[PDB]
Design a protein around this ligand. Structure first.
Ligand SMILES: Nc1ncnc2c1ncn2[C@@H]1O[C@H](COP(=O)(O)OP(=O)(O)OP(=O)(O)O)[C@@H](O)[C@H]1O
Ligand SMILES: Nc1ncnc2c1ncn2[C@@H]1O[C@H](COP(=O)(O)OP(=O)(O)OP(=O)(O)O)[C@@H](O)[C@H]1O
Ligand SMILES: Nc1ncnc2c1ncn2[C@@H]1O[C@H](COP(=O)(O)OP(=O)(O)OP(=O)(O)O)[C@@H](O)[C@H]1O
Ligand SMILES: Nc1ncnc2c1ncn2[C@@H]1O[C@H](COP(=O)(O)OP(=O)(O)OP(=O)(O)O)[C@@H](O)[C@H]1O
Ligand SMILES: [Mg+2]
Ligand SMILES: [Mg+2]
Ligand SMILES: [Mg+2]
Ligand SMILES: [Mg+2]
Lengths: 246, 246, 246, 246
C-alpha cells in the first residue's frame, strides 16, 4: 500500500509530499493529530515549497545579474537619498500607480543596487520582472526588427510588470535604433512601470539617443508620472577600495 | 484553516480532493483506521477520477463517432467469427507485434463495431487511438496538401498508436488522391497497427484506388504482419428490422 | 596512484580504457604474457570500441530505418537473383568503378533488403552512406529550394559515398519537382554510386516524373555505368503471411 | 603486432607514446615492473607532454610579445616595489578574489615585465590568459563593431580568466571608441581580474579617453577590487644603456 501511495503522490505531481510522507506519517503516529490538521500542515508545506520553486524560476527568468536587496543597503554611506522614499518605493505602490522610477547620479552610488532591490521585491510579491541594460535592449530590438519579428521581442519586453533599464547613458545609442527604446517607453506608458537608472541628466538625453525631438518625446512620456531620484555622494566602490587600503 | 486546505487543494489542481475533503474527514473522524490508509484512499479516489477524465479526453480526441464494446457484441448472431480470436485481439498483443487488423465481409456484420471495440479497448489501456473514414482521411490529406501543410496532417494520422480506417471501399477513392492513403500505410508499416474495415476483397482493391500497382503495394505492406477476419452471415441491421417487425 | 591512472585515462579521452583498467590489470597479474602484448590487447579493444561508436554515429547520420544483412537473406526463396552477383556487389567494387545498382521487380521480393544490405556493408568498411525514399528526397529538395538553400541539401545528398533511393514508382513524383531528383542523378553521375530500388520498368519512368525527355535523360545518366537486377518470384511478405496462417 | 600497436597509438592521438614505445618496452623488460605502474608512468609522461604543449599553444594564442617571469626581475634595481606584494600576487589569490592589478610609474620600470610574469604564472597554473595593448584592443573592438560582430570580439576579450592591458595612456584613444574599452571593464567587473599597466595617473584618464564621465566610471569599476602599485626609480632601459656604455 505504501508503494501505491508513493506512486499516486508522484503521479499527482507531489514529489516533496512523497519524500516527506514517511516523516509526516511517523509524526502523526507518535503524536495524536486530527486528519484535517495533518492534511493542512502537509498541504501548507507543499505550497511553501511550490512558492519557493516558483520564485526561483521567476528569478531565473528575470535575468537579474546579481541578486541584491534593500537589507544590504547602507543608507548611512548614502545620506543623499531619503530612506523614507526608498521604503515607500518598496511598497510597490508605483506598480498600481503606473509610475516609473528614475535613478540619477554619479557612478557607484547604488542606483543599480536600488533598482535590483526593487526588482527583487517585485519578484517576491509575484510581480513579473525583467532586468536589462539600455544598450542590450536597443540591440535586441534592432536584431528582432532585422529578422522581421520585432513584435515578438516587443511583447517580451512589455509583458513583464516591472522592466528595469540599467545604465542608460554610459554607452551612446545608435540613432537609427534609438526609436526602438521609445517604442518600449511608448508601449509601457501608463501600462507598466519602468525602473530606469542613469548617470546623465535629462537635458543630455538628446545626445544619448541622437535625436533631440525623439528624446523630448521619450522624456515627456517617461516623466509624465514617475519618481525621480537625484542621488549624490562619493562612489561606494571607491569607499570600499579605500577601506581595503586603510 | 479549512479554507486554507480548500485553497491549497485548488492550487494543487486537485478539484475532487477539495470537493470530497469534508466527507473523507468526517469518515476518518467517525471511523479511525490510519493516516497512511486515509491518504491512500484519498489519493486512490483522486487517481480514479483523473484516469476517468483522461480516458474521456482521449475518446474525445480520437474522433470516435459512437462508443461500442465487445460486451454488446452477440456472437450468437454472427457464428461465422470465432470469439476466441476477438478475445485474443482484445489483449492488444498486436500493438506490440506491429500486426494490422483487417475486417472484411458484407455490410452490417459488425466490422465497424469490432473496430470501434478494439479502439475503445486500446484507449482503456492508455494507448493513443484515432478513428477516421477513408474518404474523410483522403479529403483531409488533399486539403492539407493544397495548403502546403500535408506533413502536419500526416503526423496527425501517424502519431496514434492504433489508427482505424473505416468504410474503405464503399466510395471509390480519387485516383489523384488514393496515393495519400498509401503514404499513411507506408509510414505506419511495421511501426503502428492499422485496423481497416472494408467490404471489398483484396483482389478488388485495384478498383477502389484506381491503380493496380499501388493497390498491390498497399496490400503487400498491410498484409505483411496482419490478422485478417473474413466475416460472414446476414446483416445485423436487417435482423433488427425483422425483430422489430415481428 | 590508481586514481592518477584513472584521471590520465579520462584526460586522454579513453573512457573504456579507464573502465576496464582494473580488469586488464587483474588479467595481467594473474596471467603474464608481455607488456607489449598487454598494451596490444588493450589498444585493440579500445580501437574496436571506438569503431563501434563511429559506426553507430554513422548509422545515426545514415538514416537507415531497419538494419538488415545478406546473412539473413534466403536466396532459396528468391532464386530469381543469382547469389553470386550479390556477393560480387558485396565486394564494393562498384564504388571504385562508379557503377550504380538498380533493383527492379514485383513488390516485396527483397529489393530494399538487398539495398540496405549493400548500404550496411559499405558503412562497415568506412564508406559514407545515406538512405532515403524518392518522395521524401524530392519533398526535402523542394522545401530547401523554397527556402533559398537548395545547394546545402544537394551537398548533403551528394556528400555520402553510397546514396540509396527507395520507393521510386509506387508514388508518382510531382512534375514541378521531379527535376530535383534528376539534379542528384546529374550531380552523382560518375561521381558516387546510387542504389535505386523500384518496381517500374525504365520505359515507364516518364509516367513517374511526367516528362518523357526528363525521364529519358535520367535513365541515360543512371544506366551509363550501372548494374541492373531484375528480380522475380512471389512477394516474400505474402509467403510469410501464408506461413503464419499455415 | 608491433606495427598494430603503433597504428593504434597514432589513431588514439598518442604520438609521443608511440615515439617512446620501444624505450618504455625495453625499460620494462630489463627491470621488472608491475603493469599498473608501467601504465601509470607512461600516462604520466604523456600527460606531462600534453601539458607542455597546451601551455605553449596557450602562450601562442595569448599575444605575449616577449616571454618573461618573476625569477628574472631584479627587485634591487627597483626598491620602490615590495617583493612581498609581488609574491602574494603570484599566488593568484586575486583571481578567486576578482581583484585587478594596476601598475603605474615612469616608463621602463618593469611594469610590462611584471604584468607578463603574472600572466605567465597564471598560464602555468592552467588559467586562461590573454595579453593586448589598450590601443590594439580599442581598434579591434571598433573594427569588429563596424562589421556587426562586436559581441563575438567582446566574448573573446571577456572569456580569458586574466586579461592584460599594456601601455594604457601612451597613445590617446579615439573618443568615439573609448566606450568599447569601458564595455570590457563593464563585463569583466566582478567576473575576472584585469592586469593593467600605465604611465598616466588616474586623474588624467579622462584625457586618455576624452570623456571625463566615462573615465570616472571606468576607474570606479576597475578600482573597486584592485591592487595598485606605484612604481618609481630610474628607467631600466637607460640603466642597461649606461652599463653598456660604461
Ligand atoms: N549604499 C550602498 N550600500 C551597499 N552597497 C552599495 C551601496 N552603494 C553601492 N553599493 C555596491 O557598490 C557596487 C556598485 O554600486 P552600484 O552598482 O549599485 O552603483 P551604480 O550607481 O549602479 O553604478 P554605475 O553608474 O557604475 O553603474 C555594487 O556592489 C553595489 O552593491
Ligand atoms: N453481432 C452484433 N452484435 C451487436 N450489435 C451488432 C452486431 N452486428 C452489428 N451490430 C450493430 O449493427 C450496426 C451495424 O454494424 P456495423 O456498423 O458494425 O457493421 P459494418 O459491417 O461495419 O457496416 P458498414 O459496412 O455499413 O460500415 C452497428 O450498430 C453495430 O453495432
Ligand atoms: N529473400 C528474403 N529473405 C528474407 N527476408 C526477405 C526476403 N525477401 C523479402 N524479405 C523481407 O520481406 C519484407 C519486405 O522486403 P523488402 O524490405 O526487401 O522490400 P521490397 O521488396 O524492396 O519492397 P518494395 O517493392 O515495396 O520497395 C522485409 O521484411 C524483408 O526483410
Ligand atoms: N627589474 C628588472 N629586471 C629585469 N628586467 C627588467 C627590469 N625592469 C625592466 N626590465 C626589462 O626592461 C625592458 C623594459 O621594461 P618593461 O617593459 O617591463 O617596463 P615598463 O615600465 O612596462 O615600460 P614602458 O612603459 O616603457 O613600456 C623589458 O625588457 C623588461 O624586461
Ligand atoms: Mg549601475
Ligand atoms: Mg461502418
Ligand atoms: Mg522495397
Ligand atoms: Mg612597458
Amino acid at each position: 500500500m505504501k508503494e501505491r501511495i508513493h506512486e499516486y503522490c508522484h503521479r499527482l505531481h507531489l514529489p516533496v509530499m512523497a519524500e516527506r510522507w514517511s516523516a509526516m506519517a511517523e509524526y502523526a503516529s507518535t503524536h495524536n493529530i486530527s486528519y484535517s490538521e495533518f492534511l493542512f500542515r502537509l498541504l501548507e508545506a507543499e505550497i511553501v515549497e511550490k512558492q519557493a520553486r516558483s520564485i526561483q524560476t521567476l528569478i531565473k527568468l528575470s535575468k537579474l545579474p546579481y541578486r541584491k536587496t534593500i537589507d544590504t543597503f547602507d543608507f548611512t554611506a548614502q545620506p543623499s537619498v531619503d530612506e523614507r522614499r526608498i521604503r515607500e518605493l518598496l511598497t510597490l505602490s508605483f506598480i498600481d500607480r503606473k509610475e516609473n522610477i528614475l535613478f540619477l547620479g554619479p557612478p557607484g552610488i547604488g542606483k543599480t543596487h536600488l533598482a535590483i532591490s526593487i526588482g527583487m521585491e517585485a519578484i517576491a510579491r509575484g510581480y513579473k520582472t525583467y532586468f536589462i541594460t539600455a544598450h542590450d535592449l536597443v540591440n535586441q530590438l534592432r536584431r528582432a526588427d532585422q529578422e522581421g519579428k520585432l513584435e515578438k521581442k516587443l511583447r517580451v519586453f512589455v509583458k513583464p510588470t516591472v522592466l528595469i533599464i540599467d545604465e542608460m547613458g554610459y554607452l551612446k545609442l545608435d540613432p537609427n535604433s534609438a526609436h526602438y527604446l521609445f517604442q518600449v517607453i511608448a508601449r509601457r506608458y501608463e501600462h507598466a512601470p519602468i525602473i530606469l537608472t542613469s548617470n546623465k541628466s535629462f537635458g543630455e538625453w538628446g545626445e544619448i539617443v541622437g535625436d533631440s525631438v525623439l528624446a523630448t518625446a521619450m522624456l515627456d512620456r517617461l516623466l509624465h508620472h514617475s519618481i525621480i531620484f537625484n542621488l549624490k555622494g562619493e562612489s561606494y566602490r571607491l569607499r570600499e577600495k579605500r577601506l581595503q587600503e586603510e
